[model samples]
Target: MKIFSKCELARKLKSMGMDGFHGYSLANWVCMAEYESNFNTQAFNGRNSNGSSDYGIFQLNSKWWCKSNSHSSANACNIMCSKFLDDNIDDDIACAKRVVKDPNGMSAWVAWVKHCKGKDLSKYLASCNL
Candidate 1:
């Protein structure tokens, strides 16, 4: 899978309107993506401690957002988990937006909670100028 540079990703997300969602800023989303998947569109890990795998740029959990071979899901995004393993992030972004509407906002992502939540994130977009 191809990895996105900081500026490339920040710009893309901004251009796609990630500048703010549910009160969180673009940098906050970028930081969470960094810690979760390093901006790699095809990143995946199957050892999420809960016995379900994580998929794609946001590390979406199959147990909740998707279904695995062994696990059923709420399919909150209405997508197959395998779809997230591809390089297109449109689906990932759509699902993430839906996830943000939850009471926790970006806290659904542990990476966000541990690495970005409540932090000053200006540096994540300092060079992007957006």
Candidate 2:
């Protein structure tokens, strides 16, 4: 698993045009990643109430977002849950982009709602010259 520091992630996200993608700022994305997986590329949570799992830096869920052997899913992201566990986060970023296109936007992530939404998120990008 690779864990990214806050500034590192902030710069990466900004470079990928996530700063204002879907109307969510880079700080919002960085903050959500902080609370979801602490920027760990291999973070996994398999103890959801519905027996589903959350995967990777974004904690994309197995139930609706990605497919996994443990359960059936809507596969909304059209990806395998295993893809998000790798150190290369290009796929993770692509999947995250797809996620925000939904009606819920960034609110699709519970962590974003609880920690990032409407919060002073500048600290997430502080010192990151992006």
Best by lDDT: 2
lDDT tens readout by residue for model 1, 1-130: 7788877878888877888777878888889999999898888897897888899989999888886787777888888988888877888888999899988888899989998886877675777755
**Estimated TM-score for each candidate:** 0.93, 0.94
User: Could you tell me which 10 consecutive residues in candidate 2 have the lowest summed lDDT?
Assistant: 121-130
lDDT of 2 by residue, 1-130 (tens): 7999998988888888898898888888999999999999999998876789999999999999899998899998898999999998988899999999999999989988998896876575667776
lDDT for 108 in candidate 1 is 96
Candidate 2: residue 48 lDDT (0-100): 71
Model 1, global lDDT: 0.85
The parts of candidate 1 lying over 4 Å away from their true place are none
